[PDB]
Design a protein around this ligand. Sequence first.
Ligand SMILES: O=P(O)(O)O[C@@H]1[C@@H](OP(=O)(O)O)[C@H](OP(=O)(O)O)[C@@H](O)[C@H](OP(=O)(O)O)[C@H]1OP(=O)(O)O
Ligand SMILES: Nc1ncnc2c1ncn2[C@@H]1O[C@H](COP(=O)(O)OP(=O)(O)O)[C@@H](O)[C@H]1O
Ligand SMILES: [Mg+2]
Ligand SMILES: [Mg+2]
Length: 215
Amino acid sequence: IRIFPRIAGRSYIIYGQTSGIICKRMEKSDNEFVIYNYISEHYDKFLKKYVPKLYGKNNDMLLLEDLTYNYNNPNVMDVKIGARKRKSHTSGFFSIRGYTNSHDYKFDPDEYLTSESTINHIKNFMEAGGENRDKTKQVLLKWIMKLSELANDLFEINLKFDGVSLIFIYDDDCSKCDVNVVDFSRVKLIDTNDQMTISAVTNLIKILSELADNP
Ligand SMILES: O=P(O)(O)O[C@@H]1[C@@H](OP(=O)(O)O)[C@H](OP(=O)(O)O)[C@@H](O)[C@H](OP(=O)(O)O)[C@H]1OP(=O)(O)O
Ligand SMILES: Nc1ncnc2c1ncn2[C@@H]1O[C@H](COP(=O)(O)OP(=O)(O)O)[C@@H](O)[C@H]1O
Ligand SMILES: [Mg+2]
Ligand SMILES: [Mg+2]
């Protein structure tokens, strides 16, 4: 058994016994599985664009696509865009839960931040990408392109995305990047769209667009 280098969460996550798969234990209920299936049947396009593939279930374990698999030198950031259980967001509209090398910058997931500190932590996450500005702003722009489409699509989806995170990834060489939505354990059916979750994504798009544009 090989422990998966998580960025955040308390969940039991291991490498699969084969390439490109992780096993996440459903700790408290099978609700994450129920919600993958429900999204599979009602919003399959959403599942295809924005969510790691669910290959299968093994008792309490989900076999998930390893979002880090195709990266020589992956940098990962977990941002919670869904509602916290109780507790307000550490950055108002969202909470950064962790990032690759966040220890080196004295990052603390319990610390409520100003806009300045929030933006500095995202700048911190981007430092591994090096001083070549053209290729780091390409990463920012590919993230903005997918996040924009996600915020657009969220208006047409009647789910409360309580607890869901965005996983931002980029390779050290800035050759490759992505962002995807994870963690549906606390997602709920509702009769409208999720304005809190949409505001989290639009606020991130704002921050990233400010970085992509600064000189
Ligand atoms: O991620 P969602 O679901 O929102 O809730 C998590 C909660 O976050 P928030 O909701 O308070 O942000 C964490 O509290 P934090 O240390 O961040 O204050 C809990 O430690 C964690 O429960 P744990 O697994 O530790 O028992 C929850 O996950 P779960 O309920 O899916 O297990
Ligand atoms: N499919 C995935 N591929 C790669 N890393 C993942 C994947 N899903 C989760 N992770 C990693 O695991 C961490 C916790 O994921 P999450 O599903 O939110 O667990 P929890 O429900 O315990 O919060 C993330 O911060 C990320 O580092
Ligand atoms: Mg989580
Ligand atoms: Mg969870």
